Amino acid sequence: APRKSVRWCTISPAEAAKCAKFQRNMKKVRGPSVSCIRKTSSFECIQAIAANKADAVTLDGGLVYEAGLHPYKLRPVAAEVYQTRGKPQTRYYAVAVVKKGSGFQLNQLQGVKSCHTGLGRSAGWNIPIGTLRPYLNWTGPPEPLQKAVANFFSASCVPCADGKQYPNLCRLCAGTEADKCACSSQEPYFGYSGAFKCLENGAGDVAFVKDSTVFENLPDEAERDKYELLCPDNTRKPVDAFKECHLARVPSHAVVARSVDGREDLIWKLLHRAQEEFGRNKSSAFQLFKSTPEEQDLLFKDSALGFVRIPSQIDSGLYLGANYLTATQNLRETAAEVAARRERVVWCAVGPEEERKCKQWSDVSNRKVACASASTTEECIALVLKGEADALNLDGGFIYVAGKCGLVPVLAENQKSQNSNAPDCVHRPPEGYLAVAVVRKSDADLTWNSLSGKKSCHTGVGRTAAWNIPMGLLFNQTGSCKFDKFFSQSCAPGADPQSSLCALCVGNNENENKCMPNSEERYYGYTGAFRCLAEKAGDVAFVKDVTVLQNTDGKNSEPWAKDLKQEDFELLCLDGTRKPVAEAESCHLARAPNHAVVSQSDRAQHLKKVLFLQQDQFGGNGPDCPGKFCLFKSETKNLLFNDNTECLAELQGKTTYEQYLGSEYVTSITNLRRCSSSPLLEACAFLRA
Ligand SMILES: Oc1cc2cc[nH]c2cc1O
Ligand SMILES: Oc1cc2cc[nH]c2cc1O
Ligand SMILES: [Fe+3]
Ligand SMILES: [Fe+3]
């Protein structure tokens, strides 16, 4: 029945004492118990935590990063919330603070004395350094980064630095004998405030700190006017201009925990009670976000408003974002490794069969294109958000998820439409495809209004033609979220493997990976969902009109297809009727947006460039198409892009998922969400909040 205490790791005596005050006040309020373990630096608590010696520790974005690394695999449980000078936020601006009348600019630090929060921290190291990489005249990784800084700065206090090999990096540190350059509050120059005192006490000329630091230490506006900030556009602006004069915007510190059996609910229950009982002016007996004047930021970040629970999918990589990761990862990569990655385009292939095609597209492009892969479409968007992939072609349904995660549509799939197939394609207003309900002519008893308890074949959950358009329509007539109960049994890859929704699925050839939302499931996609119907595993397949058309009348020679005839098939019209597959225009459930390519708004223009080339070489009219590679072809398996794709067209203005998908469909997708929501969609609500 009972549940124990959260073991909090501490890094310095002053920190232990505060913890003790926290353990004392937790039990006196009869709330969750804590315990205090004692290590000497945050990296050690990372170690101490992964080794099940400790359970929690607040880390700076930069250490979150290090802690998420392999051997440790820790994850951010809760994010501290801060000032903002406005609305509270879980982010903050890194600044470089200097005294007025020092004359230099951001591009002149060569030979200046500098004070840092600590080795490896967002604002005190990772961020300033990566900004000065160009002036470091640094070989790259083989040569220790600390050697570059130790030569560039005349003497600095970067705590945690190897002051025995790099004395110049610890020289300015004020500390007793072995306390000097200590990686805890032992060295007075440690942390936001220590780096500030190192400046104001005249040991250093530039302070790499947080936006609040100057305000936390100089409460009187007159004091602050003796100070300024160096802006990356090589000018100086008042300390109050951080929104304008900053090196970068990092994510807030956060409490980390183990990935497996980390006791997340325990920690969270602790901190929640702690904000409620000792948060901002809740108490006087003990204040969570307050410290002793000697050493600041003990345990948490002083004067933080509280914490926010970090959703479960989120790992450090997703926590930090593309931007922060690229830069940290960029201080561990070669100048040539960096510029290579910025020029190529990493595509996220969903599953085995797409990764191979991608591999062919990689080779044939002479590596202007490279690949990354995942088992599901959500995992790929995660890759795109982490910054490990640049794009992927998505269905109207997942444009929504991507779009909710801050991703933008670059170019849209334009099927071999009908007007005048000349250079119209890339400028042809995309026109969409009609999703339909398809059943065999035979079962003539079947009508739209008799689908209840019948078997169903679905392209997949989350997707338009299938899931969203029919489930959205039925949910309007039945008023229920029990989606797995309308159809007796179904195959809809991506569902719960144990539900009726996954019953008719089939998996790959040796029957493995049943219901997996990818090509490994033979019944996955428009192709598979139609097959599901042909091979008589289901009674109604929700697909677009064209799907029946491209797999009947010997067009597809894959065994199950071969003998199929478009006459054997009919569509289920919303008004009870049934028309031949040729009547979709007057008998469809809806008109959906074409799939479209998506990327960060960052790479969309580069992404667009490489794509026009790639598609002119291997597109619908690519010289080397039949020849060596056909981007828009895959033997009916619709890999990477649909097989009837003529080219990738312009968005005609529709630059946001909202404009592209259109109002209705977006509202239709939100209505369905009242029932089910998705882990990515949630994680993205936190991340983009
Ligand atoms: O979460 C905390 C953990 C440790 C690590 C030691 N001091 C700490 C700071 C914290 O607030
Ligand atoms: O129907 C499609 C076909 C393939 C196969 C796995 N990748 C794809 C996803 C879809 O959008
Ligand atoms: Fe920080
Ligand atoms: Fe579709």
XYZ file of C-alpha atoms and ligand atoms in Angstrom:
713
model
C 0.000 0.000 0.000
C 2.558 2.713 1.082
C 5.118 4.600 -1.067
C 8.553 5.840 0.202
C 10.584 9.002 0.015
C 12.108 10.831 -2.903
C 15.897 10.940 -2.443
C 17.076 14.330 -3.458
C 20.707 14.637 -4.467
C 22.535 17.743 -3.227
C 25.901 19.194 -4.415
C 27.362 21.324 -1.608
C 27.036 21.761 2.191
C 24.972 24.917 1.870
C 22.704 22.870 -0.360
C 22.405 20.004 2.121
C 21.411 22.436 4.894
C 18.637 23.916 2.755
C 17.466 20.402 1.834
C 17.376 19.530 5.529
C 15.256 22.622 6.078
C 12.987 21.245 3.285
C 12.781 17.713 4.850
C 12.071 19.307 8.229
C 9.238 21.454 6.842
C 7.748 18.634 4.701
C 7.199 16.304 7.733
C 6.026 19.214 9.941
C 3.277 19.843 7.327
C 2.618 16.093 7.081
C 3.288 16.022 3.369
C 5.485 13.678 1.173
C 8.865 12.860 2.678
C 12.179 13.611 1.046
C 15.698 12.464 1.919
C 19.025 14.083 1.145
C 21.929 12.368 -0.492
C 25.235 14.172 -0.749
C 27.340 14.369 -3.906
C 29.787 17.177 -5.028
C 28.469 18.319 -8.423
C 25.428 18.073 -10.594
C 27.150 15.584 -12.959
C 27.625 13.351 -9.977
C 23.969 13.485 -9.080
C 23.342 12.533 -12.714
C 25.610 9.563 -11.968
C 24.217 9.122 -8.485
C 20.692 9.152 -9.923
C 21.201 6.680 -12.786
C 22.875 4.329 -10.328
C 19.763 4.305 -8.098
C 21.612 6.115 -5.296
C 19.418 9.204 -5.708
C 16.059 9.953 -7.418
C 15.904 13.656 -8.392
C 17.803 16.823 -9.281
C 17.069 20.119 -11.061
C 19.422 20.641 -13.939
C 20.101 23.439 -16.348
C 18.937 22.804 -19.928
C 22.516 22.007 -20.874
C 22.938 19.298 -18.257
C 19.462 17.945 -19.051
C 21.133 17.321 -22.340
C 24.153 15.506 -20.840
C 21.944 13.542 -18.517
C 19.786 12.328 -21.345
C 22.861 10.860 -22.967
C 23.237 7.148 -23.203
C 24.744 5.531 -20.050
C 22.453 7.696 -17.886
C 19.254 8.145 -19.908
C 17.588 10.498 -17.426
C 14.417 12.405 -18.341
C 12.892 15.836 -17.365
C 9.966 15.373 -15.065
C 9.048 18.947 -14.220
C 10.076 22.348 -15.578
C 10.625 25.374 -13.354
C 8.574 28.432 -14.312
C 10.088 31.983 -14.269
C 9.681 35.830 -14.106
C 9.624 36.919 -17.808
C 9.068 40.563 -16.807
C 5.673 39.602 -18.207
C 3.785 36.326 -18.539
C 5.398 33.349 -16.712
C 7.396 31.057 -18.963
C 9.368 27.837 -18.942
C 12.146 29.439 -21.112
C 14.625 32.221 -20.608
C 17.092 34.420 -22.383
C 20.891 34.098 -22.081
C 22.748 37.423 -21.923
C 26.303 38.706 -21.743
C 26.626 41.361 -19.111
C 29.277 44.065 -18.984
C 30.183 47.301 -17.265
C 29.571 50.543 -19.028
C 32.603 52.173 -20.565
C 34.463 48.950 -21.302
C 34.207 49.718 -24.995
C 34.382 46.256 -26.592
C 31.576 44.388 -28.465
C 30.521 40.819 -28.859
C 33.032 40.503 -31.669
C 35.989 41.655 -29.617
C 36.106 39.368 -26.600
C 39.543 38.076 -27.689
C 41.719 38.635 -24.627
C 39.034 39.744 -22.205
C 38.673 38.205 -18.742
C 35.410 36.306 -18.479
C 33.143 34.870 -15.758
C 30.903 31.846 -16.373
C 28.041 30.180 -14.508
C 29.765 26.862 -14.825
C 31.161 24.463 -17.349
C 28.428 23.080 -19.582
C 25.530 25.334 -18.634
C 23.204 26.927 -21.221
C 23.966 30.565 -20.590
C 27.318 30.259 -18.835
C 28.970 28.057 -21.427
C 27.058 26.263 -24.236
C 25.443 29.384 -25.489
C 28.261 31.977 -25.341
C 30.922 29.613 -26.666
C 28.938 28.405 -29.633
C 28.488 32.102 -30.452
C 32.272 32.603 -30.339
C 33.184 29.391 -32.158
C 34.116 31.512 -35.213
C 36.675 33.504 -33.213
C 38.129 30.517 -31.380
C 40.223 29.348 -34.380
C 39.510 25.813 -33.281
C 40.439 22.635 -35.064
C 37.224 20.994 -33.974
C 36.483 17.948 -31.660
C 39.885 16.136 -31.690
C 41.198 19.257 -29.836
C 39.490 19.814 -26.395
C 37.069 22.746 -26.504
C 38.461 23.935 -23.232
C 41.858 24.559 -24.900
C 40.255 26.935 -27.355
C 38.577 28.980 -24.609
C 41.624 28.800 -22.336
C 43.611 30.627 -25.046
C 40.900 33.020 -26.241
C 40.012 34.351 -22.778
C 42.952 35.785 -20.829
C 41.763 34.215 -17.572
C 38.273 33.162 -16.590
C 36.233 31.451 -13.952
C 34.407 28.571 -15.574
C 33.724 26.323 -12.600
C 33.951 22.579 -13.097
C 36.823 23.412 -15.511
C 40.021 21.381 -15.424
C 42.108 24.017 -13.644
C 45.142 21.644 -13.575
C 45.428 21.309 -17.342
C 43.673 24.603 -18.140
C 44.681 26.961 -15.290
C 43.542 29.963 -17.354
C 39.946 28.683 -17.170
C 39.964 28.720 -13.326
C 42.370 31.588 -12.476
C 39.701 34.219 -11.757
C 37.778 31.895 -9.489
C 37.715 33.058 -5.900
C 37.804 29.964 -3.740
C 39.916 28.676 -0.869
C 42.587 26.002 -1.575
C 40.776 23.106 -3.371
C 37.507 25.065 -3.327
C 38.915 27.086 -6.232
C 36.835 26.471 -9.350
C 34.692 23.987 -7.424
C 31.611 22.797 -9.260
C 29.223 23.585 -6.406
C 28.353 26.693 -4.443
C 31.744 26.143 -2.823
C 33.339 28.416 -5.368
C 31.666 31.811 -4.855
C 31.859 32.403 -8.571
C 29.519 29.521 -9.280
C 26.118 30.026 -10.867
C 24.245 33.045 -12.154
C 25.040 35.195 -9.175
C 28.647 34.121 -8.751
C 29.334 34.934 -12.384
C 27.708 38.328 -11.658
C 29.814 39.055 -8.549
C 32.958 38.017 -10.526
C 31.982 40.883 -12.893
C 30.940 43.513 -10.310
C 33.969 42.736 -8.131
C 36.224 43.556 -11.097
C 37.884 40.171 -11.553
C 36.222 39.791 -14.963
C 34.977 42.029 -17.804
C 32.022 40.002 -19.213
C 29.451 37.843 -17.434
C 27.668 35.092 -19.154
C 24.375 34.886 -17.273
C 20.524 34.866 -17.263
C 18.278 37.852 -18.046
C 17.150 38.203 -14.444
C 20.553 38.092 -12.759
C 21.213 41.858 -12.964
C 17.771 42.525 -11.547
C 18.094 39.967 -8.771
C 21.299 41.590 -7.572
C 20.769 45.299 -8.276
C 17.234 46.143 -7.039
C 17.821 49.853 -7.591
C 17.556 51.062 -11.248
C 20.515 53.388 -10.651
C 22.773 50.405 -9.953
C 21.757 48.746 -13.236
C 22.585 51.773 -15.319
C 26.261 51.179 -14.592
C 25.725 48.009 -16.663
C 24.905 46.956 -20.216
C 24.491 43.911 -22.491
C 26.447 42.890 -25.617
C 24.061 42.129 -28.521
C 25.039 39.614 -31.271
C 24.791 42.505 -33.754
C 27.809 44.005 -32.085
C 26.216 46.892 -30.211
C 25.235 47.582 -26.607
C 21.771 48.056 -25.080
C 20.481 48.573 -21.481
C 20.173 45.541 -19.155
C 16.418 45.912 -19.487
C 16.636 45.051 -23.227
C 17.124 41.271 -23.008
C 14.236 40.594 -25.305
C 16.303 42.520 -27.832
C 19.899 41.934 -26.768
C 20.364 38.259 -26.173
C 22.623 35.505 -27.369
C 19.860 32.856 -27.345
C 16.578 31.633 -25.642
C 17.020 28.334 -23.813
C 14.596 26.070 -22.041
C 14.229 26.450 -18.288
C 15.991 24.149 -15.857
C 14.002 21.087 -14.965
C 13.914 18.269 -12.414
C 15.255 15.074 -13.984
C 14.599 11.437 -13.018
C 15.237 7.946 -14.349
C 13.593 6.746 -17.584
C 12.522 3.410 -16.065
C 11.130 3.092 -12.530
C 12.015 6.676 -11.867
C 9.179 7.263 -9.502
C 7.726 10.157 -11.416
C 4.464 10.306 -9.463
C 6.463 10.361 -6.236
C 8.610 13.352 -7.225
C 5.713 15.237 -8.741
C 3.567 14.695 -5.633
C 6.479 16.118 -3.651
C 7.050 19.244 -5.696
C 3.318 19.920 -6.065
C 2.873 19.948 -2.285
C 6.076 21.935 -2.017
C 4.789 24.731 -4.322
C 1.472 24.787 -2.587
C 2.977 24.799 0.891
C 6.315 26.642 0.420
C 6.010 28.281 -2.965
C 5.698 32.004 -3.486
C 4.684 33.622 -0.138
C 2.650 30.522 0.760
C 4.791 30.285 3.910
C 7.322 32.039 6.186
C 8.411 28.876 8.046
C 10.413 27.880 4.949
C 10.471 29.145 1.385
C 11.173 26.679 -1.405
C 12.408 29.282 -3.851
C 14.591 31.308 -1.448
C 18.216 30.777 -0.375
C 20.896 32.139 1.943
C 22.746 35.332 0.703
C 26.116 33.587 0.801
C 25.147 31.077 -1.886
C 22.293 31.505 -4.308
C 20.138 29.118 -6.328
C 20.364 26.307 -3.796
C 18.188 23.429 -4.700
C 15.866 25.355 -7.036
C 16.170 28.549 -9.039
C 15.412 31.351 -6.607
C 12.239 33.318 -7.255
C 10.811 30.804 -9.738
C 7.003 30.706 -9.697
C 6.799 26.931 -9.490
C 6.883 23.835 -11.685
C 4.828 22.369 -14.491
C 4.608 18.622 -15.015
C 6.363 17.584 -18.165
C 4.215 15.156 -20.175
C 5.493 11.549 -20.432
C 6.679 11.091 -24.069
C 9.086 14.030 -23.757
C 12.721 13.094 -23.432
C 15.603 15.576 -23.096
C 15.940 15.855 -26.838
C 12.328 16.845 -27.242
C 12.571 18.944 -24.091
C 15.298 21.154 -25.528
C 14.159 21.396 -29.163
C 15.935 21.488 -32.521
C 17.649 24.776 -31.879
C 19.203 24.070 -28.497
C 20.338 20.572 -29.502
C 21.896 21.539 -32.764
C 24.074 24.125 -30.964
C 25.095 21.870 -28.067
C 25.684 18.961 -30.446
C 27.558 21.509 -32.580
C 30.222 22.084 -29.962
C 31.030 18.414 -30.285
C 31.138 18.215 -34.105
C 33.673 19.382 -36.778
C 33.173 22.652 -38.768
C 32.901 20.359 -41.804
C 30.386 18.016 -40.063
C 28.161 21.050 -39.231
C 28.072 22.742 -42.646
C 27.432 19.280 -44.264
C 24.266 18.725 -42.199
C 22.955 22.225 -43.051
C 23.204 21.481 -46.851
C 21.750 18.026 -47.028
C 18.086 17.162 -46.261
C 17.336 14.310 -43.945
C 14.071 12.544 -44.869
C 12.209 10.516 -42.296
C 11.262 7.200 -43.718
C 8.438 5.375 -41.985
C 9.347 1.688 -41.778
C 11.585 -0.801 -43.598
C 10.215 -0.434 -47.129
C 10.461 3.369 -47.127
C 13.952 3.420 -45.677
C 15.188 1.329 -48.602
C 13.579 3.597 -51.214
C 15.013 6.482 -49.299
C 18.384 4.734 -49.459
C 18.063 4.581 -53.239
C 17.006 8.229 -53.327
C 20.029 9.021 -51.170
C 22.582 7.319 -53.415
C 21.125 8.589 -56.660
C 21.174 12.186 -55.367
C 24.837 11.936 -54.419
C 23.849 12.564 -50.818
C 22.059 15.879 -51.241
C 19.463 13.683 -49.485
C 20.024 11.336 -46.512
C 17.633 9.309 -44.382
C 16.377 8.740 -40.898
C 13.799 6.191 -39.995
C 11.140 5.354 -37.433
C 8.355 2.684 -37.112
C 5.419 5.143 -37.020
C 4.565 8.547 -38.434
C 4.553 10.130 -34.967
C 8.071 8.928 -34.268
C 9.160 10.720 -37.403
C 7.563 14.036 -36.405
C 9.413 13.544 -33.113
C 12.650 13.200 -35.140
C 11.751 16.368 -37.051
C 11.095 18.181 -33.738
C 14.295 16.897 -32.156
C 16.082 18.182 -35.271
C 17.293 14.781 -36.471
C 15.282 14.810 -39.701
C 14.186 17.648 -42.014
C 10.932 16.426 -43.481
C 8.385 13.807 -44.471
C 5.308 13.720 -46.649
C 2.204 13.590 -44.465
C -1.476 12.869 -44.741
C -4.002 15.658 -44.132
C -4.509 14.085 -40.713
C -0.913 14.180 -39.618
C -0.353 17.648 -41.139
C -2.626 18.476 -38.165
C -0.401 16.840 -35.558
C 2.748 18.282 -37.140
C 0.991 21.601 -37.458
C 0.104 21.530 -33.813
C 3.796 20.885 -33.058
C 4.917 23.977 -34.855
C 5.730 22.357 -38.200
C 4.776 24.039 -41.505
C 3.768 22.632 -44.882
C 6.395 23.271 -47.561
C 5.017 21.761 -50.791
C 1.933 19.686 -51.588
C 1.441 16.488 -53.513
C -0.368 17.147 -56.798
C -1.662 13.866 -58.305
C -1.684 13.483 -62.106
C -4.714 15.759 -62.293
C -6.672 16.526 -65.433
C -6.669 19.856 -67.298
C -3.407 20.252 -69.262
C -0.458 18.280 -67.777
C 2.218 20.759 -68.932
C 4.239 22.878 -66.450
C 0.907 23.483 -64.700
C 1.689 20.933 -61.952
C 3.970 22.986 -59.670
C 1.550 25.964 -59.991
C -1.670 24.032 -60.417
C -3.937 24.852 -57.528
C -3.993 21.609 -55.559
C -7.488 20.167 -55.802
C -7.609 17.300 -53.276
C -9.007 13.760 -53.416
C -12.357 12.286 -52.444
C -12.456 9.893 -49.540
C -15.049 7.130 -50.079
C -16.759 4.157 -48.558
C -16.207 1.141 -50.736
C -18.003 -2.263 -50.608
C -18.381 -5.087 -53.169
C -21.370 -4.893 -55.482
C -22.394 -8.371 -54.202
C -23.175 -7.507 -50.610
C -25.972 -5.325 -51.985
C -27.740 -5.553 -48.659
C -25.075 -3.189 -47.327
C -25.857 0.542 -47.185
C -24.266 3.408 -45.217
C -26.982 3.121 -42.673
C -26.366 -0.574 -42.011
C -22.614 -0.432 -41.293
C -23.204 -0.969 -37.553
C -21.568 -4.185 -36.391
C -20.050 -4.864 -39.833
C -16.326 -5.470 -40.335
C -14.141 -2.514 -41.392
C -10.922 -1.856 -43.234
C -9.099 1.409 -42.411
C -6.036 3.034 -43.910
C -4.990 3.786 -40.375
C -5.953 5.765 -37.343
C -5.355 9.517 -37.494
C -5.485 9.548 -41.274
C -8.055 11.372 -43.394
C -9.699 9.171 -46.061
C -9.977 6.469 -43.441
C -10.262 7.369 -39.708
C -11.020 11.119 -39.601
C -13.664 11.397 -42.328
C -15.725 8.290 -41.542
C -15.233 8.213 -37.752
C -16.049 11.898 -37.713
C -19.300 11.269 -39.591
C -20.402 8.233 -37.518
C -19.520 10.016 -34.276
C -22.124 12.592 -35.342
C -24.875 9.959 -35.796
C -24.069 7.717 -32.806
C -22.952 10.327 -30.273
C -20.400 7.901 -28.797
C -16.639 7.751 -28.372
C -16.691 3.997 -28.248
C -15.191 3.777 -31.761
C -14.109 0.184 -31.359
C -17.728 -0.858 -30.851
C -19.376 0.538 -33.965
C -17.581 -1.944 -36.197
C -17.752 -5.614 -35.049
C -14.086 -6.134 -35.919
C -11.711 -4.018 -37.992
C -8.208 -3.542 -39.238
C -6.957 -0.029 -38.602
C -3.204 -0.016 -38.087
C -1.915 1.929 -35.161
C -4.739 1.020 -32.883
C -4.312 -0.900 -29.593
C -3.005 -4.321 -30.705
C -5.477 -5.909 -28.244
C -8.654 -4.129 -29.493
C -11.288 -5.080 -32.065
C -9.820 -2.300 -34.222
C -6.779 -4.563 -34.777
C -8.593 -7.884 -35.243
C -8.604 -8.222 -39.064
C -5.136 -6.875 -39.418
C -2.575 -9.324 -40.695
C 0.992 -8.102 -40.343
C 3.795 -8.933 -42.704
C 4.279 -12.291 -44.483
C 5.263 -14.526 -41.508
C 2.414 -12.823 -39.614
C 4.558 -10.562 -37.427
C 3.857 -6.862 -36.655
C 0.082 -7.084 -36.738
C -1.598 -3.692 -36.696
C 1.691 -1.796 -36.877
C 0.972 1.524 -38.656
C 3.309 1.013 -41.640
C 4.008 -1.115 -44.798
C 5.023 -4.123 -42.692
C 1.305 -4.503 -42.172
C 0.012 -5.677 -45.542
C -3.341 -4.173 -44.838
C -1.875 -0.764 -44.029
C -2.552 2.227 -46.333
C -5.041 2.783 -49.208
C -3.602 -0.171 -50.882
C -3.812 -2.458 -47.845
C -7.220 -1.119 -46.818
C -8.542 -1.998 -50.219
C -6.858 -5.327 -50.150
C -8.408 -5.894 -46.723
C -11.671 -5.683 -48.585
C -10.730 -7.729 -51.665
C -9.296 -10.654 -49.705
C -12.643 -10.609 -47.838
C -11.218 -9.836 -44.392
C -13.579 -6.877 -44.014
C -16.864 -5.587 -45.510
C -16.234 -1.865 -45.957
C -13.006 -0.098 -46.807
C -12.695 3.622 -46.406
C -10.350 4.852 -49.116
C -10.192 7.469 -51.861
C -11.880 6.776 -55.196
C -8.637 6.416 -57.076
C -7.492 3.517 -54.847
C -10.040 1.112 -56.244
C -9.204 2.347 -59.723
C -5.436 1.743 -59.489
C -5.799 -1.821 -58.127
C -8.413 -3.373 -60.389
C -8.635 -4.374 -64.064
C -5.166 -5.975 -64.061
C -3.417 -2.664 -63.366
C -1.947 -4.158 -60.191
C -0.570 -7.595 -60.934
C 0.135 -8.509 -57.327
C -1.676 -11.892 -56.819
C -4.617 -10.668 -54.685
C -5.224 -7.844 -57.154
C -4.659 -9.259 -60.670
C -8.232 -10.505 -61.368
C -9.928 -7.556 -59.699
C -12.471 -5.656 -61.793
C -13.872 -2.157 -61.123
C -17.349 -3.576 -61.747
C -17.200 -5.889 -58.727
C -16.969 -2.688 -56.655
C -19.417 -0.005 -55.631
C -19.366 2.998 -53.264
C -21.626 3.788 -50.338
C -23.234 7.204 -50.735
C -24.182 9.305 -47.711
C -27.838 9.282 -48.748
C -28.256 5.503 -48.455
C -27.556 4.895 -52.159
C -24.870 2.870 -54.027
C -23.170 3.962 -57.312
C -20.340 2.348 -59.384
C -16.819 3.298 -58.459
C -16.930 5.723 -61.368
C -19.540 7.875 -59.581
C -17.462 9.126 -56.650
C -18.108 12.766 -57.607
C -21.771 12.424 -56.564
C -21.117 9.669 -53.995
C -18.270 10.343 -51.582
C -18.007 11.108 -47.916
C -15.793 14.219 -48.414
C -13.055 16.130 -50.243
C -9.740 16.068 -48.358
C -6.387 17.960 -48.539
C -3.603 16.287 -50.492
C -0.760 15.018 -48.424
C 1.985 17.558 -48.161
C 5.639 17.862 -47.189
C 6.424 19.472 -43.833
C 9.478 20.813 -42.069
C 10.336 23.516 -39.531
C 9.683 26.998 -41.007
C 13.487 27.153 -40.640
C 14.371 24.730 -43.437
C 11.240 25.096 -45.529
C 12.969 27.288 -48.171
C 16.093 25.192 -48.420
C 13.829 22.142 -48.259
C 11.848 23.629 -51.140
C 15.004 24.208 -53.210
C 16.491 20.725 -53.010
C 12.979 19.322 -53.728
C 12.427 21.101 -56.999
C 15.736 19.775 -58.260
C 15.273 16.274 -56.978
C 11.807 16.113 -58.518
C 12.873 17.483 -61.940
C 15.544 14.853 -62.154
C 13.331 11.918 -60.885
C 9.776 13.334 -60.898
C 6.698 12.758 -63.025
C 8.758 13.851 -66.011
C 12.216 13.137 -64.695
C 14.713 12.377 -67.480
C 16.259 9.735 -65.283
C 12.886 8.434 -64.043
C 12.343 5.109 -65.794
C 16.080 5.258 -66.218
C 17.637 5.259 -62.713
C 15.124 6.410 -59.995
C 11.454 7.499 -59.952
C 10.670 9.494 -56.905
C 6.910 9.211 -57.332
C 6.739 5.463 -58.040
C 6.921 2.286 -55.942
C 5.027 -0.673 -57.445
C 1.677 0.379 -55.859
C 2.976 0.376 -52.268
C 2.698 4.221 -52.181
C 6.124 4.618 -50.449
C 7.429 8.027 -49.385
C 4.885 9.707 -51.690
C 1.792 8.417 -53.510
C 2.397 6.660 -56.827
C 0.075 8.879 -58.773
C 1.965 12.005 -57.768
C 2.897 14.161 -60.749
C 5.062 16.652 -58.885
C 5.163 18.584 -55.616
C 3.225 21.858 -56.051
C 3.116 25.290 -54.360
C 0.628 25.966 -51.536
C -1.280 28.803 -53.307
C -0.967 30.924 -50.161
C -1.994 28.278 -47.619
C 1.160 28.464 -45.504
C -0.096 27.237 -42.050
C -1.828 23.908 -41.318
C -4.976 25.919 -40.599
C -5.110 27.613 -44.032
C -4.026 24.416 -45.795
C -6.408 21.896 -44.249
C -9.147 24.422 -44.078
C -11.412 25.410 -41.186
C -14.075 22.632 -41.286
C -11.663 19.697 -41.385
C -9.631 21.314 -38.578
C -12.791 21.764 -36.514
C -13.852 18.264 -37.524
C -10.543 16.974 -36.195
C -10.889 18.824 -32.923
C -14.438 17.471 -32.457
C -13.150 13.890 -32.747
C -10.404 14.678 -30.239
C -13.084 15.043 -27.494
C -12.955 11.231 -27.538
C -9.285 10.374 -28.099
C -6.186 12.577 -28.002
C -2.602 11.488 -28.850
C 0.646 11.535 -26.786
C 2.456 13.612 -29.393
C -0.383 16.118 -29.641
C -0.226 16.579 -25.816
C 3.561 16.716 -25.524
C 3.304 19.407 -28.187
C 0.745 21.351 -26.131
C 3.331 21.694 -23.367
C 6.275 22.319 -25.698
C 4.469 25.024 -27.681
C 2.935 26.760 -24.668
O 16.243 19.531 -7.923
C 17.446 19.740 -7.145
C 18.460 18.757 -7.026
C 19.705 19.090 -6.574
C 21.001 18.647 -7.099
C 21.662 19.174 -5.872
N 21.189 20.457 -5.619
C 19.934 20.413 -6.271
C 19.099 21.353 -6.899
C 17.712 21.004 -6.899
O 16.599 21.887 -6.735
O -0.330 4.803 -47.672
C 1.079 5.155 -47.452
C 2.074 4.180 -47.897
C 3.313 4.049 -47.198
C 4.000 2.730 -46.584
C 4.596 3.114 -45.171
N 4.791 4.447 -45.605
C 3.618 4.960 -46.131
C 2.578 5.668 -45.459
C 1.425 6.027 -46.271
O 1.027 7.413 -46.227
Fe 20.496 28.034 -16.795
Fe -4.901 10.377 -47.635
